[PDB]
Amino acid sequence: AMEDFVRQCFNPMIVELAEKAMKEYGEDLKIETNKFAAICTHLEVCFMYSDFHFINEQGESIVVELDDPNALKHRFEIIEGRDRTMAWTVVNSICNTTGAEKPKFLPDLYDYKENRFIEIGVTRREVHIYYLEKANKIKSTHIHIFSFTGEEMATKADYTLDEESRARIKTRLFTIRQEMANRGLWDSFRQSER
Ligand SMILES: [Mn+2]
Ligand SMILES: [Mn+2]
């Protein structure tokens, strides 16, 4: 039921990137079907946060630019979603160009406005738990956590984005949760986080 849900309710490129991720790090999506949904969600939130466009101005899909980019153009640079070697190449170029501090951990985004890397997380539990889990390792890089029920927690209470873009992420999370609950999948998905 959950695998069917994911494939019907996330966009095809998101599902492709998630399946790729699971094939690579050795997770079987037939077994870890809740984690498959969680990887899809995490990817979608990061792409939405960055305002990344998967179709170019000439009307063509450009998924290839995650693993083989051209120039490094907008307020946010995506780091999540890329091949790990290429993600580190992007982080290094960024630090070279901006003089920003090179993080010890691979972050999700670079913010050229605030000159910091951002670490994104999505939780089905009380937001502070996953915030602290992340923050007690991560020691520099800005953290922004979203829960499915609309709470957020961020470093210094600085949410980076405007109220409207944040609301778009929250809305999408509420819709996912809702549709899972309709299919009887939410309770298992929530419980599997612990
Ligand atoms: Mn990440
Ligand atoms: Mn992250």
**Residue bearing tokens 């998630």:** 18
Q: Round to the nearest angstrom and report the end-to-end CA distance of the chain.
A: 21
Q: Which residues contact 29 (CB under 8 A, 6 or more apart)?
A: 3, 19, 22, 35, 36
Active-site annotation, residues: 80, 108
Ligand closest to the CA atom of residue 49: 2
Dump the DSSP string for 63-108: GGGTTS------SEEE-TTS-HHHHHHHHHHHHHHH-PPPPSS--S
Give the C-alpha separation, 41 to 81, whole Å: 12
Residue 186, number of CB atoms within 10 A of its CB:
17
- Tell me how far the alpha carbon of residue 96 lies from the centroid of ligand 2, in angstroms: 22
Q: Please give the distance, rounded to the nearest whole angstrom, from the Cα atom of residue 112 to the centre of ligand 1.
A: 18
Please give the Cα distance from 72 to 94 (Å, whole number): 8
Residues with CB under 5 A from ligand 2 (ion): 108, 120
Binding site, annotated residues: 42, 80, 108, 119-120
Ligand with an atom nearest the CA of residue 45: 2
Tokens of 22: 């699971």
Method underlying the structure: X-ray
Q: How far is the CA of 182 from the centre of ligand 1 (A)?
A: 29
How is the chain split among helix, strand and coil, in percent rounded to 5? 50, 15, 40
88 exposure class (CB count in 10 Å sphere: 0-12, 13-18, 19+): middle
3-state SS, residue 8: helix
CA distance 52 to 76: 8
What total number of domains does the chain contain? Answer: 1
Spacing, Cα 49 to ligand 2 middle (Å) = 12
The three-state secondary structure class of 128 is helix
Closest ligand to residue 84's CA: 1
Q: Is 40 exposed, middle or buried (0-12, 13-18, 19+ CB in 10 A)?
A: buried
Pairing of strands 142-147, 76-78: unpaired
How far apart CA 101 and CA 95 sit, in angstroms, is 6
- Residues that constitute the known binding site for Mn(2+): 42, 80, 108, 119-120
Domain that holds residue 61: 1-194
- 193 CA distance to ligand 1 middle (Å): 17
If you search the block for the tokens 């600085």, which residue do you land on?
A: 158
- Rounded CA separation 193/38 (Å): 9
- CA 56 to CA 53: how far, in whole Å? 7
